[model samples]
Target: GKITFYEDRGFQGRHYECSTDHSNLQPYFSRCNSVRVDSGCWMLYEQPNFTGCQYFLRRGDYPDYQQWMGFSDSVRSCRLIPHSSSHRIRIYEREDYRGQMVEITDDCPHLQDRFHFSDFHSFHVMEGYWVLYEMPNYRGRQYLLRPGEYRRYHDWGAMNARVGSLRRIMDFY
Candidate 1:
């Protein structure tokens, strides 16, 4: 199925629509640095639930191939991961800075040329974990990492911990 885009009052911007059912929307190519359709926005419904939520991508200029899942509650967030399939990884939340921009340095070896927020389940890697900072006013939510398991978030944070993890952790408010 194709995903639809609409303007959100709270977001004061465009947001994508995903059906309650798990279905594929339009097919498009997205790279790193791509902007999410619903970044820095809130869910339409209060305390959205994802039991039957749908996923869709945006359409228009700079058509990106990022997918968005709708939930009943706004507290829920999505994470991104570089996995071959959905089960391999998951996306937690999306962010679009008004003035702040992500700068890529030589240190980010795993940083993709076109970094899409929906590409990985977490922000970036640091130390040896798939690191993702808590959202503004977001309380602690322990993510269970499997034994002998490594994922994209870890790799992403490992490259730019300052911009990807620490900064976000401190700036979230």
Candidate 2:
């Protein structure tokens, strides 16, 4: 994917074009006030190494950082979104897929309230891709899970067992 970042608003001033994931954008520019995504959707991170809050982007022109729900001009990393179909997923409260569970083919606004648990120890993606929110109402940390079996919390790259909400990433760009 091709994308350009500008240091000033309205796509002016110093800038850079990136065609691949940027793990540490700090080396090139401390912040990007605007961006022009020429192709595909992307994930923008607030901190380096893809850690911190994430802002999803699609092919468009963002005259300001706020266009992507960014609180600051600080954007440290970017990644291209992959293609996926279907949205079937099963979350389990116990490891090895044994215990209370919920099968989902759509978004879950509050997994904890629905499942009566604050965390999901394991999950299996039976069909498509899904973004798991570390906190309720799709807030907090985010983890992407593709179609496959995630028999343990670590399999989904989660720091802990928390899974407060989830959303299916629909097709874009």
Candidate 3:
């Protein structure tokens, strides 16, 4: 993916273009107020080394940090999420894959509406990447889920097990 970061809003000021994962973008730009995603999906982190708050962005123009639901102009790290053709994930009600389990292949705008539950303790991403939201409709805190096994909520870097929605990561453009 091709992503450009602008130190100032509206794509102005010092800019840095990246095609791969950047653990530390502070050296390239002082701050990130605007961004242009030319291709593929990306996960921008507030802190370096892909830690802290994260935001998922697709191919488009973000005139300012607020456009991506950023807490501040602190985009210190980024990862280009690879595109996938298929998606499959399993959610568990308890840690270690115990208790009620549900496998999914489609996006759930409101997880509780279909799963009868709002909190998932474990996850197994067997197919593609996905995004987990703290609130329904993809709002609130965001956690990027790549193909792997999450024995507990913390394994996915979430504060808790509250997952209101889920979306597969695919190239829509």
lDDT of 1 by residue, 89-121 (tens): 222333322222343222222222334442233
Q: Which whole-number lDDT from 0 to 100 does residue 87 have in model 3?
A: 96
TM-score per prediction, in order, is: 0.19, 0.69, 0.95
Worst 10 residues of 3 by lDDT: 111-120
- For candidate 2, lDDT tens digit of each residue in 26-83? 8777779999988876778888888766776778899998787676898899887776
Most accurate candidate by lDDT: 3
Could you tell which candidate, 1 or 3, scores higher by lDDT?
Answer: 3
Residue-pair clashes per prediction, in order, are 33, 0, 0
* Candidate numbers, best TM-score first, in rank order: 3, 2, 1
How would you encode candidate 3's per-residue C-alpha lDDT over 78-157 as one tens digit per residue? 99998788999998888999888899999988877888554578889999999998889998889999999999878888
Q: Which consecutive 10 residues in model 1 have the weakest lDDT in total?
A: 164-173
User: How many residue-pair clashes does candidate 2 contain?
Assistant: 0
C-alpha lDDT values of all predictions: 0.26, 0.80, 0.90
lDDT of 2: 0.80
List ranges where model 3 is wrong by over 4 Å: 116-118
